[PDB]
């Protein structure tokens, strides 16, 4: 009896719905009474399915409401663990242990990527007599990122950046930056969320109405 | 001897307390047994799990020659013995003995 995995590594976007799979042999019908499936991540228990009975009390608190074993796949010889709304906390080494006419286990590494992809912007008129505007860019990601403001002609402009931890997940950062500039209509501005080694940049375009 | 306590419907991992490299397998004999009854034999690279242990036992060779028992039932409770024998010049000499008693509880 041999347990197999399609992917031994999953790289998942933060907030995504991820399903990691372990395949095991099934012949014609599935004897639910002879099936044992466990899903765990390092020291945390996720799934305990023995002889067609799933215990929920065994599941770790961090996974409640988000993790489930897709029992429809079991018929097809697939122990599929679905985790919805993936957190940074879900990064780690998963392991499935299966018993169905013999026993085996496989390990899956999961890496969670939290880019500053969803940039929220706000353009406000501070004083129309002097055409002063206040521009704001805010995004959450991991690790910390600096905000860089650039003019239409790509010259850097001084802003005020505040970095705190996200309320959604303690590891995640909430970075907000504000630029105050006397500017006219239809001008284009850029706010860049720079994160280092590996260097990754996320820029939002802001147009003054 | 180690007295391990586990719960019904859990997985028990009983360790041999001995790590063998893959190269050393060709000249090593591993014997896991429960209550003087054979469980599995790694005989110079050749694994053989006994019929009463095929369906629920895993042999993690890379992890201290441990045995994993999925879906613990009160039957699984008992004394387990792991033996190592390394071939040297003449024949196989005993290298290691591991004793571990499983207590499966409600
Ligand atoms: C990710 O999955 C979310 C949860 O889905 C539900 O609960 C799971 C535990 C599982 O049983 C699922 O099969 C089940 O649908 C889901 O809420 C989320 O959003 C879905 O997509 C739309 C919004 O983004 C919306 O139209 C759907 O109604 C919504 N699903 C539900 C049930 O509200 C899924 N998001 C992604 C990015 O896939
Ligand atoms: C050890 O497991 C075997 C495996 O049989 C199958 O296991 C699953 C894959 C599932 O599809 C089951 O429905 C199968 O039975 C057991 O062997 C079978 O046992 C039944 C009676 O219990 C018998 O009618 C079958 O012919 C057996 N087939 C073979 C080839 O073994 C076996 O009973 C289990 N033994 C122990 C010690 O638990
Ligand atoms: C992120 O930061 C903004 C600005 O401080 C704040 O109003 C918002 O509630 C924060 N959101 C989270 C999820 O931390
Ligand atoms: C930008 O606006 C201020 C008024 O808010 C005005 O004095 C001037 O035109 C600009 N300030 C500077 C220092 O350029
Ligand atoms: C045994 O311990 C660990 C893994 O269990 C490993 O680093 C070490 O090299 C192992 N020893 C041998 C002989 O392989």
Residue numbers in the entry:
A (entry chain B): 19 to 227
B (entry chain A): 35 to 140
Sentences copied from the publication:
Intriguingly, CD80 not only has a well-documented role modulating T cell responses via the CTLA-4 and CD28 co-receptors, but also recently has been demonstrated to bind PD-L1 in cis on the surface of antigen-presenting cells (APC). The WT CD80 extracellular domain (ECD) is comprised of a membrane-proximal IgC domain and a distal IgV domain. To address this, here we utilize directed evolution to engineer a CD80 IgV domain with increased PD-L1 affinity and fuse this to an immunoglobulin Fc domain, creating a therapeutic (ALPN-202, davoceticept) capable of providing CD28 costimulation in a PD-L1-dependent fashion while also antagonizing PD-1 - PD-L1 and CTLA-4–CD80/CD86 interactions.
To better understand the PD-L1–CD80 interaction, we co-crystallized the CD80 IgV domain from ALPN-202 complexed with a PD-L1 ECD and solved a CD80:PD-L1 structure. The structure shows that the CD80 vIgD interacts with the IgV domain of the PD-L1 ECD. PD-L1 binds CD80 on a surface that does not overlap with the CD28–CTLA-4 binding site. The contact surface between PD-L1 and the CD80 vIgD overlays the contact surface of PD-L1 and PD-1, demonstrating how ALPN-202 blocks PD-1–PD-L1 binding. Atezolizumab contact residues on PD-L129 indicate that the ALPN-202 CD80 vIgD contacts PD-L1 at an overlapping epitope. PD-L1, but not CTLA-4, bound ALPN-202 in the presence of saturating amounts of CD28, indicating separate binding surfaces. Some mutations specifically affect binding to PD-L1 (i.e. E35D and M47L) while others appear to contribute in combination (i.e. V68M). The affinity of ALPN-202 for PD-L1, CD28, and CTLA-4 was 505 nM, 9.9 nM, and 1.87 nM, respectively, under the experimental conditions used. Thus, simultaneous binding of both PD-L1 and CD28 is not only possible, it is a functionally active interaction.
